[PDB]
């Protein structure tokens, strides 16, 4: 492993130091349908005419990115994405920009969001939940080894590929940092106590989010929920969690450790790093090597009907893509 990571850090660093730019053009793609919509952009299923491949094209409105002060975060996202490589991280195939928008073209994950399947099914059995959790454990070990913090773990950002494996998406909050960071960002239900308390935090917030994920996947609902964020924040910092009666004793033990408000006792952040997680009882049946190689039997296989199919994604209101006659935020995005 430490051998694998060593070589991984070498490849990341070369790309990190010399990121690729403008590797494609808007008119090389056929705009098909919207797969998701955000505050400063949207993602559409796209088709590359030269190869006939389908991709997920993320279109970000430069002016909106500026109004929401997400410039540096957007630069982080593209720069990090074009340099990483793991089987559970979606691939950035191309990136470019025009007068009005920034564009990031990634691999299309037809399976849809874990969110959708989770809410429909209700809850995943422990073996199912464990299968996905394992993948997040290795992905974080990988990312963290690169001095990267992900900061936005949740079902909405995890996709299921054809083989039933996870593909982490949305790196808008990803950041390479040695030392503490203070940006308040993420999603309410998944924010660690340190973040909500504005006290400088590190990679340990990712391990806490994992604890929230595993709980939600297994119970069908998050450990901390309420109609308004402030109520949720109040629960998160209280350091009080209740477990369904069906949670195995080992599952509860793993979560008590991950959902530790005291980030000096929180698993993943201790002296033995991720191993305190990997060597945990709840993970005894887990073969980490098998998972990384994708040779483990997937519990759920989302099936589709050929490429270009979007039935596993909700429908969104379409909106024509417009590009002004004038460049809009040149200097802000020069490095993109």
């Amino acid at each position: 492993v430490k051998e694998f990571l060593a070589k991984a850090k070498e490849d990341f660093l070369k790309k990190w130091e010399n990121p690729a730019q403008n590797t494609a053009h808007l008119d090389q793609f056929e705009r098909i349908k919207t797969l998701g919509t955000g505050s400063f952009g949207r993602v559409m299923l796209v088709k590359h005419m030269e190869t006939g491949n389908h991709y997920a094209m993320k279109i970000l409105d430069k002016q909106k990115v500026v109004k929401l002060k997400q410039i540096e975060h957007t630069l982080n996202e593209k720069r990090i994405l074009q340099a990483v490589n793991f089987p559970f991280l979606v691939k950035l195939e191309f990136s470019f920009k025009d007068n009005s928008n920034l564009y990031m073209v990634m691999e299309y994950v037809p399976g849809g969001e874990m969110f959708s399947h989770l809410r429909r099914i209700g809850r995943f059995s422990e073996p199912h939940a464990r299968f996905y959790a394992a993948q997040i454990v290795l992905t974080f070990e990988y990312l963290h080894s690169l001095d990267l913090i992900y900061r936005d773990l949740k079902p909405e950002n995890l996709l299921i590929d054809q083989q039933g494996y996870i593909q982490v998406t949305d790196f808008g909050f990803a950041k390479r940092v040695k030392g503490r960071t203070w940006t308040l960002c993420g999603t309410p239900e998944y924010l660690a106590p340190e973040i909500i308390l504005s006290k400088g935090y590190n990679k340990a917030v990712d391990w806490w989010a994992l604890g929230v994920l595993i709980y939600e996947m297994a119970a069908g609902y998050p450990p901390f929920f309420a109609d308004q964020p402030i109520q949720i924040y109040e629960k998160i910092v209280s350091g009080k969690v209740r477990f369904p009666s069906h949670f195995s004793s080992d599952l509860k033990d793993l979560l008590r450790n991950l959902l530790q408000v005291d980030l000096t006792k929180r698993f993943g952040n201790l002296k033995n790093g991720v191993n305190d997680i990997k060597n945990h009882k709840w993970f005894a049946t887990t073969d980490w090597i098998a998972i990384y190689q994708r040779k483990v039997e997937a519990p759920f296989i989302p099936k589709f009907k050929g490429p270009g199919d979007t039935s596993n994604f909700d429908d969104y209101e379409e909106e024509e893509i417009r590009v002004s006659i004038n460049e809009k935020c040149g200097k802000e995005f020069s490095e993109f």
Partner: peptide, 20 residues
Amino acid sequence: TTYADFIASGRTGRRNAIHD
């Protein structure tokens, strides 16, 4: 049941991220 309280809450849809 917690499940019932969750399903009846306004937080069962896609949750938006926060920052500012």
